[PDB]
């Protein structure tokens, strides 16, 4: 039952405070037995490891179980369950009896919450007698051992709240192995790649900066993904030997050619993993915390956003700046959290510019579609908001975008519904409360900034309000060129179209509609001319928006925001 020497203390990295504590709370009771016997003190300790799943709790237990060399008893909660009436409780009793008989010994109750769940809620008889048997077992250790040979019980669980309070109190030490920091992620990558061949240009400082929400388990997949990149080129050379061996798309042929050479293998040359592969591996790997609840990064870049230079400078200084280089903004005394409220008339680019920031910052992105978090049950709407900021904090830096936010934070009045007033007060505490949310950047977009609660629109929650209004005559030239060149006439005609007095009051959405109406005028011109050539004598002309088509659109498209001042004020 001796611990196998397959996991090494070097295999666990990024945790140093934890390994510093375990040197006096696990190593000393088990290895320094004589020191405890000098004072006649029974130093039987119990250490509970808890944290997010994937934070190397099981590997830490096995790492320190091979670094000590004492008897190790790995226990999995389902393994102590039997079909007989009394066999289930007898198996747990035999575990602690054997540990005392083999003192000094280390018990590892991995996933202890599976069998040691609350007996005050799970009202069964086997389940309650298993919990009571563990308490009795963990107390026999403190008394039945020969004083100088202590027994330490290690338990790991990612749901410490499910434990029975009468059992959770029996673990003197609880260690919270949280998500690794930037310094810790660098050490984990080195310990995961220490047996691999790297191309000597791997900058782990950059790798740690580009993995904001990763845990120890997630970083293993990045190394695992990066390894497959190096061997991707060694499979194409294998497919070439198969494609040229023989005389249904391309992927289907690969699965069939490799099936044919099933009894024959080709040695793969050893290759190093370059920095480009690692940078490519990070994009292919989604963090365990990012699996659900996170929106896909918008495709919009700054090349899609025309004009809005003032808005672009504010969003770069408030969000994109601190995300990319937080060290510079920390020195001047800028908190790593921003609150931006984009507001203005509809169609002027509020959502577009907030989708470029989510894309240019290259950070994690969560998008909320108006009142998307509301639920019919009493507590499920406030719980969704609290869980929303729990994910964002765990994966900082993160950008929270509230599109059409006036439906989620209505101004709190007496006439306001109670169910919609609890969500507002929930957001007040999440944005700025006892638990600071540093690393969460919030963007709000709305047409009615005066309908947002006045407590939200304060610094620390949504500090800055950026007005995104109607473009000027000079701005409409940049926007029309931006819309045209991103969808394919030249540029001299686009300037004439955008500067026309018929485009007075056009918003950003009207210019996009103007281009569509010009394209529709092009198709009518194509349709009529195609029939005339086809019928008279095999007929396909090039569809291109000509200047004559822009004339039809200008006489067809009218502005949509009739009264900008209704949205320009307040």
């Amino acid at each position: 039952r001796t611990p196998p020497t397959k996991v090494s203390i070097l295999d666990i990295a990024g945790v140093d405070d934890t390994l510093q504590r375990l040197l006096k709370e696990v190593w000393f009771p088990l290895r320094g037995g004589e020191a405890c016997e000098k004072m006649g003190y029974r130093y039987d300790n119990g250490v509970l490891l808890h944290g997010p799943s994937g934070c190397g709790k099981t590997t830490l237990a096995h790492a320190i179980a091979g670094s000590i060399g004492v008897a190790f008893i790995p226990v999995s909660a389902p393994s102590v369950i039997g079909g007989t009436s009394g066999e289930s409780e007898k198996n747990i009793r035999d575990v602690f009896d054997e540990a005392i008989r083999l003192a000094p010994c280390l018990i590892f109750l991995d996933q202890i919450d599976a069998i040691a769940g609350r007996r005050e809620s799970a009202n069964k008889g086997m389940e309650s007698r298993i919990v009571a048997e563990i308490m009795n077992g963990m107390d026999r250790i403190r008394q039945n051992t020969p004083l100088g040979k202590n027994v330490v019980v290690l338990a790991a669980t990612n749901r410490p709240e499910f434990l029975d309070p009468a059992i959770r109190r029996r673990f003197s030490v609880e260690i919270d192995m949280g998500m690794p920091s930037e310094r810790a992620r660098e050490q984990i990558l080195r310990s995961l790649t220490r047996d691999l061949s790297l191309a000597d240009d791997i900058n782990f400082k950059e790798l740690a900066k580009m993995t904001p929400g990763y845990v120890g388990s997630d970083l293993q997949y990045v190394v695992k993904a990066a390894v497959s990149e190096s061997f991707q080129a060694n499979i194409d050379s294998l497919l070439a030997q198969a494609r040229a061996k023989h005389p249904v798309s391309q992927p289907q042929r690969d699965w069939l050619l490799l099936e044919a050479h099933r009894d024959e293998e080709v040695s793969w040359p050893s290759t190093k993993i370059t920095m480009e592969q690692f940078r490519k591996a990070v994009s292919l790997v989604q963090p365990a915390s990012k699996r659900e609840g996170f929106s896909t990064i918008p495709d919009t870049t700054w090349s899609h956003v025309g004009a809005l230079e003032d808005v672009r400078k504010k969003l770069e200084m408030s969000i994109i700046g601190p995300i990319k280089n937080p060290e510079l903004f920390t020195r001047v005394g800028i908190k790593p959290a921003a609150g931006i409220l984009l507001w203005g008339p509809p169609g002027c680019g509020k959502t577009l510019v907030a989708k470029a920031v989510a894309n240019e910052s290259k950070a994690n992105f969560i998008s909320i579609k108006g009142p998307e978090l509301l639920n019919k049950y009493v507590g499920e709407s406030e719980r969704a908001v609290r869980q929303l900021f729990s994910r964002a904090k765990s994966s900082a830096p993160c950008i929270l975008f509230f599109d059409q936010m006036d439906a989620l934070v209505p101004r709190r009045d007496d006439s306001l519904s109670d169910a919609s007033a609890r969500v507002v007060n929930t957001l007040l505490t999440e944005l700025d409360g006892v638990g600071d949310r540093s690393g969460i950047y919030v963007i709000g977009a709305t047409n009615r900034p005066d309908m947002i609660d006045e407590a939200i629109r304060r610094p620390g929650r949504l500090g800055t309000s950026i007005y995104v209004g109607l473009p000027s005559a000079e701005d409409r030239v940049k926007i029309l060129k931006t819309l045209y060149r991103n969808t394919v006439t030249t540029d001299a005609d686009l300037e004439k179209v955008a500067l026309d007095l018929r485009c007075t009051g056009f918003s950003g959405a009207d210019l996009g509609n103007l281009m569509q109406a010009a394209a529709q005028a092009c198709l009518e011109r194509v349709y009529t001319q195609r029939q005339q050539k086809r019928k008279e004598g095999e007929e396909e002309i090039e569809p291109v928006i000509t200047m004559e088509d822009w004339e039809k659109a200008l006489n067809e498209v009218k502005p949509s925001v009739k009264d900008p001042e209704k949205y320009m004020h307040s």
Binding site: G83, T84, S85, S88, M126, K376, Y377, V378, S417, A419
Partner: peptide, 23 residues
């Protein structure tokens, strides 16, 4: 004859709801 431990079905619960008012 040995009696084995057998798992069974679970109980049902109640859920509160919130209802809006147009007035």
């Amino acid at each position: 004859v040995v009696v084995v431990v057998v798992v069974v079905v679970v109980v049902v619960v109640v859920v509160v709801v919130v209802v809006v008012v147009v007035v």
